[PDB]
Amino acid sequence: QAIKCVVVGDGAVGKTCLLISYTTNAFPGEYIPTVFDNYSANVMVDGKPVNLGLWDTAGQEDYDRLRPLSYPQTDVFLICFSLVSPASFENVRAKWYPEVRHHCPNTPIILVGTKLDLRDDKDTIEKLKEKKLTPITYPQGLAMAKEIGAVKYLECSALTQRGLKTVFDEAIRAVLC
Amino acid sequence: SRTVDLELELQIELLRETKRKYESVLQLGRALTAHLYSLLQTQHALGDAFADLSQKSPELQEEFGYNAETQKLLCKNGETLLGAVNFFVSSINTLVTKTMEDTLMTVKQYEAARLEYDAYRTDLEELSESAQATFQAHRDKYEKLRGDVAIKLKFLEENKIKVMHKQLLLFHNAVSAYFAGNQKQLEQ
Amino acid sequence: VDLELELQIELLRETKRKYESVLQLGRALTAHLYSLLQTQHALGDAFADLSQKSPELQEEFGYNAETQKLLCKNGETLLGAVNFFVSSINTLVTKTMEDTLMTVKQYEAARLEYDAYRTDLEESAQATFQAHRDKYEKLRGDVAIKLKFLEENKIKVMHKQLLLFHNAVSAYFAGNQKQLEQTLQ
Ligand SMILES: Nc1nc2c(ncn2[C@@H]2O[C@H](COP(=O)(O)OP(=O)(O)O)[C@@H](O)[C@H]2O)c(=O)[nH]1
Ligand SMILES: [Mg+2]
C-alpha cells in the first residue's frame, strides 16, 4: 500500500533528521543533507507491505505559499515541535494546526515531540534555565494533542532513535485504521 | 484435475498484470511529484538568492537578475505541472485502487466458489439425497460468479480505456505546456 | 586605511555566506534534477512496455513514452551544465575566496598584536615594536591586494558561469519544444 505522510512544523525542530534517521538508521550528524529533498521507505506494519513516502517541508514564512503545494493527496500529517523548544510548541496550535486544517480538513494528524534525548539533558535543562525557560512535559504535549484533535501524541529522538520507529508505525496505523 | 475456464482465466491473469504495471506507473507518478516539489523549492530559493546578489552586485547585476527571473518563473510553471501530475496520480489511483480492485473482489469469490465446487466433487469421488442437492448449490454459485466475473471484466476494460485515454492525454498536455509557457517567457 | 579595510572585510565575509548558499542550493539542483531523470527514464520504460502490450491505448501510451525518453535524453546534458556551474563556483569559494580569508585572518591578528604592544608601551620592546609594525603593515598591503584580486576574479568567473548556466537552461527548454512539436506527427 502507498501512504503519503508529510512532516510540518517550525524549522530547527528536527523534521529533516527525523526522516533521515528513520529511513537510513543513522542520525544525519556531521554533514547535514541536500536541501528540499524528500524520502521514502519500505516497511512491514502488522504483516502488511507499505510504501511510505516522506515529504519534508520548509518551516520558514517565505515558504508559506509553497509548502502547502505538498498537501494534496496526503494520508497523514506529522506536526512537530522540539521538546526543548517552547517556541515551536506554541506554534503548533498557533500556525501549523490551522494551516494543515485549512488545506486538509479530515486528515489524520499526529503530534510529535522531537529531541527527546534533550528534555532530560543536564546542560540543556540549564542553558534553558538561563533563559528562564523549561522543557515541554508529556502532559503538555498530550494536552496539545487533544486541543488540535490529533489521533496520537508521540515523543522521540532522531539521535537515540528512542520512540522513532513508533512514530511511523502509528502513523501508518492511523491510515490503515 | 480442475475446473478450467481457460478463456476467462486468461482475462483474469491479464487483469492482474495490467494491475501491477499500473501500480508501477503509479509509483513513478507519485515520485515524479516529489521531485517537482523539490525543484520548485530549490528554484524558489535560488531565485531569491540570485535576486539578492543582483541587488548587491553591480558588476554582475544583469547576469544575476537574468537568472533570478527565469528561476522565479520556472518555479511557478512548476506548480502547474505538479498540480496536473497530482491529478494524474490521483485519478489512476482510483482506477487501480477502487474500480479495478472492486472487480478483483468478485474474481476472488469466483475461484473460491470454483474451488469448493471442485472440492466437494472430489470428496464424492474418493468416497464413492441432499448430496446431489449441495452438489448443485456449489455448481450454481460457481456458475453465478463465473458470470459476474465475465460481466465486470468487460465493464472494466471498458472504463480502463476511457480513463487512461483521458489521463494520458492530459498528462502529456501538461508536461508539454510545461515548456510552451516556459520558452515563450524564458526566451521572451 | 583600517576601518575602511574593516568594512571591506565585513563585506567579504557576507559575500562568502551568500555564495556558500548558492553553492548548496546548486548542489541541490544537481540532486533533484538527477532524480527527475531517473524517474523519467523509469516512467519511460513503463509507458513503453505498456504501449507494446496494450493495443487499446498503444498510441497514447506510445507518444507519452517517447516524450519521457526525449526529456530524459536532453535532461542529462542539462545536468552536465549544472554540475559544471556548481563545480566552477566551488573553486571560486573553496579556494580563491578562501585563500583571501586566510590572509585576512592573519592580518587581523597582526593588527591586534600591534595595537596591543603599541599600547603596552605608550604607558625587547622597541626592537619588537618595529618588527610588529613591520608584520602588520606588510599584511595590510597584502590584504589590499587579495581583496582587489578576489573582486576582479569573482567577476571574470561569475559572468561566464552565470551566463553558461542560463544558456544551458534555455537550451534545455528550447531543445524540447522542437522535438516535442516534431512528435506531433
Ligand atoms: N539531541 C538531538 N538533536 C537533534 C535531534 N533532531 C535534530 N536535532 C538537531 O536539531 C537541529 C535541526 O535539525 P534539522 O532536522 O535540520 O531541523 P529541521 O530540518 O528544521 O526540522 C540540528 O542541529 C540537529 O542536530 C534529536 O533528536 N536529538
Ligand atoms: Mg529541514
PDB file of all heavy atoms in Angstrom, chain A residues 10-18 27 32 56-57 60 114-118 156-160, ligand 1:
ATOM      1  N   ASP A  10       7.895  24.108  12.669  1.00  0.00           N
ATOM      2  CA  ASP A  10       8.978  25.092  12.680  1.00  0.00           C
ATOM      3  C   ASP A  10      10.310  24.548  12.236  1.00  0.00           C
ATOM      4  O   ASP A  10      10.610  23.368  12.422  1.00  0.00           O
ATOM      5  CB  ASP A  10       9.167  25.650  14.087  1.00  0.00           C
ATOM      6  CG  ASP A  10       8.141  26.705  14.441  1.00  0.00           C
ATOM      7  OD1 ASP A  10       7.029  26.704  13.852  1.00  0.00           O
ATOM      8  OD2 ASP A  10       8.450  27.532  15.327  1.00  0.00           O
ATOM      9  N   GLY A  11      11.123  25.424  11.663  1.00  0.00           N
ATOM     10  CA  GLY A  11      12.440  24.996  11.253  1.00  0.00           C
ATOM     11  C   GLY A  11      13.257  24.834  12.520  1.00  0.00           C
ATOM     12  O   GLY A  11      13.041  25.547  13.512  1.00  0.00           O
ATOM     13  N   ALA A  12      14.179  23.879  12.490  1.00  0.00           N
ATOM     14  CA  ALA A  12      15.068  23.588  13.608  1.00  0.00           C
ATOM     15  C   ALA A  12      14.422  22.742  14.701  1.00  0.00           C
ATOM     16  O   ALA A  12      14.964  22.617  15.804  1.00  0.00           O
ATOM     17  CB  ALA A  12      15.598  24.876  14.194  1.00  0.00           C
ATOM     18  N   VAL A  13      13.266  22.155  14.410  1.00  0.00           N
ATOM     19  CA  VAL A  13      12.616  21.320  15.403  1.00  0.00           C
ATOM     20  C   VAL A  13      13.146  19.891  15.274  1.00  0.00           C
ATOM     21  O   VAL A  13      13.179  19.154  16.257  1.00  0.00           O
ATOM     22  CB  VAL A  13      11.099  21.327  15.229  1.00  0.00           C
ATOM     23  CG1 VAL A  13      10.593  22.749  15.279  1.00  0.00           C
ATOM     24  CG2 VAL A  13      10.724  20.682  13.915  1.00  0.00           C
ATOM     25  N   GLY A  14      13.564  19.503  14.065  1.00  0.00           N
ATOM     26  CA  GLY A  14      14.104  18.164  13.862  1.00  0.00           C
ATOM     27  C   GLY A  14      13.531  17.352  12.705  1.00  0.00           C
ATOM     28  O   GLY A  14      13.907  16.191  12.500  1.00  0.00           O
ATOM     29  N   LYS A  15      12.632  17.967  11.940  1.00  0.00           N
ATOM     30  CA  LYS A  15      11.987  17.308  10.810  1.00  0.00           C
ATOM     31  C   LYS A  15      12.936  16.532   9.892  1.00  0.00           C
ATOM     32  O   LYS A  15      12.764  15.334   9.701  1.00  0.00           O
ATOM     33  CB  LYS A  15      11.199  18.340   9.988  1.00  0.00           C
ATOM     34  CG  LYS A  15      10.224  19.177  10.827  1.00  0.00           C
ATOM     35  CD  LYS A  15       9.367  20.138   9.997  1.00  0.00           C
ATOM     36  CE  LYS A  15      10.169  21.238   9.304  1.00  0.00           C
ATOM     37  NZ  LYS A  15      10.754  22.231  10.246  1.00  0.00           N
ATOM     38  N   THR A  16      13.935  17.208   9.330  1.00  0.00           N
ATOM     39  CA  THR A  16      14.874  16.569   8.403  1.00  0.00           C
ATOM     40  C   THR A  16      15.602  15.363   9.013  1.00  0.00           C
ATOM     41  O   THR A  16      15.616  14.280   8.423  1.00  0.00           O
ATOM     42  CB  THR A  16      15.923  17.602   7.855  1.00  0.00           C
ATOM     43  OG1 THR A  16      15.246  18.697   7.212  1.00  0.00           O
ATOM     44  CG2 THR A  16      16.842  16.945   6.839  1.00  0.00           C
ATOM     45  N   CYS A  17      16.191  15.539  10.194  1.00  0.00           N
ATOM     46  CA  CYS A  17      16.910  14.445  10.859  1.00  0.00           C
ATOM     47  C   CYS A  17      15.997  13.273  11.194  1.00  0.00           C
ATOM     48  O   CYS A  17      16.422  12.119  11.205  1.00  0.00           O
ATOM     49  CB  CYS A  17      17.562  14.938  12.153  1.00  0.00           C
ATOM     50  SG  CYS A  17      18.796  16.228  11.924  1.00  0.00           S
ATOM     51  N   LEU A  18      14.746  13.589  11.495  1.00  0.00           N
ATOM     52  CA  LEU A  18      13.752  12.584  11.832  1.00  0.00           C
ATOM     53  C   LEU A  18      13.639  11.617  10.670  1.00  0.00           C
ATOM     54  O   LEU A  18      13.823  10.409  10.830  1.00  0.00           O
ATOM     55  CB  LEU A  18      12.402  13.258  12.074  1.00  0.00           C
ATOM     56  CG  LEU A  18      11.165  12.392  12.282  1.00  0.00           C
ATOM     57  CD1 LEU A  18      11.192  11.797  13.679  1.00  0.00           C
ATOM     58  CD2 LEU A  18       9.916  13.255  12.101  1.00  0.00           C
ATOM     59  N   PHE A  27      21.663   8.891  12.391  1.00  0.00           N
ATOM     60  CA  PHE A  27      21.465  10.311  12.625  1.00  0.00           C
ATOM     61  C   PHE A  27      22.319  11.063  11.610  1.00  0.00           C
ATOM     62  O   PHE A  27      23.533  10.875  11.556  1.00  0.00           O
ATOM     63  CB  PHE A  27      21.906  10.676  14.041  1.00  0.00           C
ATOM     64  CG  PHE A  27      21.602  12.092  14.419  1.00  0.00           C
ATOM     65  CD1 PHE A  27      20.307  12.474  14.747  1.00  0.00           C
ATOM     66  CD2 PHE A  27      22.601  13.050  14.426  1.00  0.00           C
ATOM     67  CE1 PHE A  27      20.014  13.793  15.077  1.00  0.00           C
ATOM     68  CE2 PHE A  27      22.318  14.372  14.752  1.00  0.00           C
ATOM     69  CZ  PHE A  27      21.021  14.742  15.079  1.00  0.00           C
ATOM     70  N   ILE A  32      24.916  17.340   7.415  1.00  0.00           N
ATOM     71  CA  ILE A  32      23.621  17.967   7.099  1.00  0.00           C
ATOM     72  C   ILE A  32      23.377  18.004   5.561  1.00  0.00           C
ATOM     73  O   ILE A  32      23.945  18.829   4.834  1.00  0.00           O
ATOM     74  CB  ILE A  32      23.509  19.395   7.759  1.00  0.00           C
ATOM     75  CG1 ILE A  32      23.511  19.266   9.298  1.00  0.00           C
ATOM     76  CG2 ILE A  32      22.212  20.097   7.325  1.00  0.00           C
ATOM     77  CD1 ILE A  32      22.269  18.588   9.909  1.00  0.00           C
ATOM     78  N   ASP A  56       9.333  16.222   3.322  1.00  0.00           N
ATOM     79  CA  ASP A  56       9.922  17.175   4.254  1.00  0.00           C
ATOM     80  C   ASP A  56       9.407  18.550   3.820  1.00  0.00           C
ATOM     81  O   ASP A  56       8.973  18.729   2.674  1.00  0.00           O
ATOM     82  CB  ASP A  56      11.439  17.134   4.151  1.00  0.00           C
ATOM     83  CG  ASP A  56      12.124  17.774   5.337  1.00  0.00           C
ATOM     84  OD1 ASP A  56      11.499  18.616   6.015  1.00  0.00           O
ATOM     85  OD2 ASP A  56      13.308  17.446   5.582  1.00  0.00           O
ATOM     86  N   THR A  57       9.440  19.526   4.715  1.00  0.00           N
ATOM     87  CA  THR A  57       8.945  20.841   4.341  1.00  0.00           C
ATOM     88  C   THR A  57       9.794  21.963   4.887  1.00  0.00           C
ATOM     89  O   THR A  57      10.683  21.751   5.708  1.00  0.00           O
ATOM     90  CB  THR A  57       7.497  21.058   4.821  1.00  0.00           C
ATOM     91  OG1 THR A  57       7.466  21.003   6.252  1.00  0.00           O
ATOM     92  CG2 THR A  57       6.567  19.979   4.247  1.00  0.00           C
ATOM     93  N   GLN A  60       9.969  27.887   7.550  1.00  0.00           N
ATOM     94  CA  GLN A  60      10.025  29.331   7.344  1.00  0.00           C
ATOM     95  C   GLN A  60       8.788  29.979   6.720  1.00  0.00           C
ATOM     96  O   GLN A  60       8.016  29.332   6.004  1.00  0.00           O
ATOM     97  CB  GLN A  60      11.241  29.662   6.488  1.00  0.00           C
ATOM     98  CG  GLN A  60      12.570  29.224   7.090  1.00  0.00           C
ATOM     99  CD  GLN A  60      12.697  27.710   7.283  1.00  0.00           C
ATOM    100  OE1 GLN A  60      12.438  26.920   6.361  1.00  0.00           O
ATOM    101  NE2 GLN A  60      13.117  27.302   8.485  1.00  0.00           N
ATOM    102  N   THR A 114       9.973  16.152  19.411  1.00  0.00           N
ATOM    103  CA  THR A 114      11.277  15.688  18.976  1.00  0.00           C
ATOM    104  C   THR A 114      12.384  16.072  19.939  1.00  0.00           C
ATOM    105  O   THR A 114      12.158  16.825  20.886  1.00  0.00           O
ATOM    106  CB  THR A 114      11.601  16.273  17.603  1.00  0.00           C
ATOM    107  OG1 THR A 114      11.525  17.701  17.671  1.00  0.00           O
ATOM    108  CG2 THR A 114      10.601  15.784  16.570  1.00  0.00           C
ATOM    109  N   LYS A 115      13.588  15.560  19.678  1.00  0.00           N
ATOM    110  CA  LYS A 115      14.768  15.831  20.506  1.00  0.00           C
ATOM    111  C   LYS A 115      14.551  15.397  21.955  1.00  0.00           C
ATOM    112  O   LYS A 115      15.027  16.043  22.890  1.00  0.00           O
ATOM    113  CB  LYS A 115      15.123  17.326  20.466  1.00  0.00           C
ATOM    114  CG  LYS A 115      15.407  17.876  19.074  1.00  0.00           C
ATOM    115  CD  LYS A 115      16.013  19.281  19.123  1.00  0.00           C
ATOM    116  CE  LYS A 115      16.201  19.840  17.708  1.00  0.00           C
ATOM    117  NZ  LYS A 115      16.820  21.195  17.680  1.00  0.00           N
ATOM    118  N   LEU A 116      13.822  14.297  22.125  1.00  0.00           N
ATOM    119  CA  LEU A 116      13.516  13.743  23.440  1.00  0.00           C
ATOM    120  C   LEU A 116      14.765  13.576  24.293  1.00  0.00           C
ATOM    121  O   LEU A 116      14.753  13.846  25.491  1.00  0.00           O
ATOM    122  CB  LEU A 116      12.827  12.386  23.275  1.00  0.00           C
ATOM    123  CG  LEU A 116      12.511  11.551  24.518  1.00  0.00           C
ATOM    124  CD1 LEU A 116      11.574  12.317  25.440  1.00  0.00           C
ATOM    125  CD2 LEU A 116      11.879  10.233  24.084  1.00  0.00           C
ATOM    126  N   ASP A 117      15.845  13.126  23.675  1.00  0.00           N
ATOM    127  CA  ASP A 117      17.087  12.929  24.396  1.00  0.00           C
ATOM    128  C   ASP A 117      17.544  14.207  25.124  1.00  0.00           C
ATOM    129  O   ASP A 117      18.264  14.147  26.123  1.00  0.00           O
ATOM    130  CB  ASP A 117      18.170  12.437  23.428  1.00  0.00           C
ATOM    131  CG  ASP A 117      18.349  13.353  22.237  1.00  0.00           C
ATOM    132  OD1 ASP A 117      17.380  13.526  21.458  1.00  0.00           O
ATOM    133  OD2 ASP A 117      19.459  13.904  22.076  1.00  0.00           O
ATOM    134  N   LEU A 118      17.104  15.362  24.639  1.00  0.00           N
ATOM    135  CA  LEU A 118      17.497  16.627  25.252  1.00  0.00           C
ATOM    136  C   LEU A 118      16.636  17.073  26.434  1.00  0.00           C
ATOM    137  O   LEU A 118      17.138  17.728  27.348  1.00  0.00           O
ATOM    138  CB  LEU A 118      17.504  17.737  24.202  1.00  0.00           C
ATOM    139  CG  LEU A 118      18.467  17.565  23.034  1.00  0.00           C
ATOM    140  CD1 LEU A 118      18.342  18.779  22.138  1.00  0.00           C
ATOM    141  CD2 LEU A 118      19.896  17.411  23.537  1.00  0.00           C
ATOM    142  N   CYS A 156       9.927  11.499  20.577  1.00  0.00           N
ATOM    143  CA  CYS A 156      11.059  10.710  20.122  1.00  0.00           C
ATOM    144  C   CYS A 156      12.350  11.496  19.965  1.00  0.00           C
ATOM    145  O   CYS A 156      12.382  12.721  20.115  1.00  0.00           O
ATOM    146  CB  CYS A 156      10.736  10.021  18.797  1.00  0.00           C
ATOM    147  SG  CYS A 156      10.823  11.095  17.361  1.00  0.00           S
ATOM    148  N   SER A 157      13.410  10.751  19.667  1.00  0.00           N
ATOM    149  CA  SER A 157      14.742  11.292  19.466  1.00  0.00           C
ATOM    150  C   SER A 157      15.379  10.700  18.206  1.00  0.00           C
ATOM    151  O   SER A 157      15.680   9.508  18.159  1.00  0.00           O
ATOM    152  CB  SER A 157      15.625  10.965  20.664  1.00  0.00           C
ATOM    153  OG  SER A 157      16.988  11.181  20.333  1.00  0.00           O
ATOM    154  N   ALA A 158      15.575  11.530  17.184  1.00  0.00           N
ATOM    155  CA  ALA A 158      16.191  11.071  15.948  1.00  0.00           C
ATOM    156  C   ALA A 158      17.654  10.713  16.224  1.00  0.00           C
ATOM    157  O   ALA A 158      18.333  10.121  15.389  1.00  0.00           O
ATOM    158  CB  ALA A 158      16.109  12.166  14.896  1.00  0.00           C
ATOM    159  N   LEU A 159      18.133  11.069  17.408  1.00  0.00           N
ATOM    160  CA  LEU A 159      19.516  10.805  17.761  1.00  0.00           C
ATOM    161  C   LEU A 159      19.720   9.412  18.380  1.00  0.00           C
ATOM    162  O   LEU A 159      20.610   8.660  17.966  1.00  0.00           O
ATOM    163  CB  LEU A 159      19.999  11.889  18.723  1.00  0.00           C
ATOM    164  CG  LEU A 159      21.503  12.147  18.810  1.00  0.00           C
ATOM    165  CD1 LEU A 159      21.760  13.087  19.976  1.00  0.00           C
ATOM    166  CD2 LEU A 159      22.274  10.856  19.003  1.00  0.00           C
ATOM    167  N   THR A 160      18.908   9.082  19.381  1.00  0.00           N
ATOM    168  CA  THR A 160      18.994   7.791  20.052  1.00  0.00           C
ATOM    169  C   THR A 160      17.885   6.902  19.512  1.00  0.00           C
ATOM    170  O   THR A 160      17.598   5.835  20.054  1.00  0.00           O
ATOM    171  CB  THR A 160      18.795   7.934  21.578  1.00  0.00           C
ATOM    172  OG1 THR A 160      17.446   8.317  21.853  1.00  0.00           O
ATOM    173  CG2 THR A 160      19.718   8.992  22.141  1.00  0.00           C
TER     174      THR A 160
HETATM  175  N1  LIG D   1      19.827  15.849  20.506  1.00  0.00           N
HETATM  176  C1  LIG D   1      19.145  15.904  19.372  1.00  0.00           C
HETATM  177  N2  LIG D   1      19.295  16.929  18.433  1.00  0.00           N
HETATM  178  C2  LIG D   1      18.540  16.904  17.303  1.00  0.00           C
HETATM  179  C3  LIG D   1      17.619  15.879  17.117  1.00  0.00           C
HETATM  180  N3  LIG D   1      16.993  16.080  15.949  1.00  0.00           N
HETATM  181  C4  LIG D   1      17.517  17.178  15.374  1.00  0.00           C
HETATM  182  N4  LIG D   1      18.473  17.694  16.185  1.00  0.00           N
HETATM  183  C5  LIG D   1      19.236  18.909  15.920  1.00  0.00           C
HETATM  184  O1  LIG D   1      18.328  19.961  15.598  1.00  0.00           O
HETATM  185  C6  LIG D   1      18.895  20.796  14.580  1.00  0.00           C
HETATM  186  C7  LIG D   1      17.897  20.926  13.414  1.00  0.00           C
HETATM  187  O2  LIG D   1      17.709  19.649  12.837  1.00  0.00           O
HETATM  188  P1  LIG D   1      17.003  19.593  11.399  1.00  0.00           P
HETATM  189  O3  LIG D   1      16.375  18.312  11.140  1.00  0.00           O
HETATM  190  O4  LIG D   1      17.920  20.134  10.254  1.00  0.00           O
HETATM  191  O5  LIG D   1      15.873  20.702  11.672  1.00  0.00           O
HETATM  192  P2  LIG D   1      14.667  20.849  10.675  1.00  0.00           P
HETATM  193  O6  LIG D   1      15.048  20.265   9.308  1.00  0.00           O
HETATM  194  O7  LIG D   1      14.304  22.292  10.614  1.00  0.00           O
HETATM  195  O8  LIG D   1      13.497  20.021  11.223  1.00  0.00           O
HETATM  196  C8  LIG D   1      20.201  20.145  14.137  1.00  0.00           C
HETATM  197  O9  LIG D   1      21.325  20.851  14.613  1.00  0.00           O
HETATM  198  C9  LIG D   1      20.160  18.741  14.721  1.00  0.00           C
HETATM  199  O10 LIG D   1      21.449  18.235  15.060  1.00  0.00           O
HETATM  200  C10 LIG D   1      17.466  14.876  18.069  1.00  0.00           C
HETATM  201  O11 LIG D   1      16.525  14.070  18.051  1.00  0.00           O
HETATM  202  N5  LIG D   1      18.235  14.897  19.197  1.00  0.00           N
END
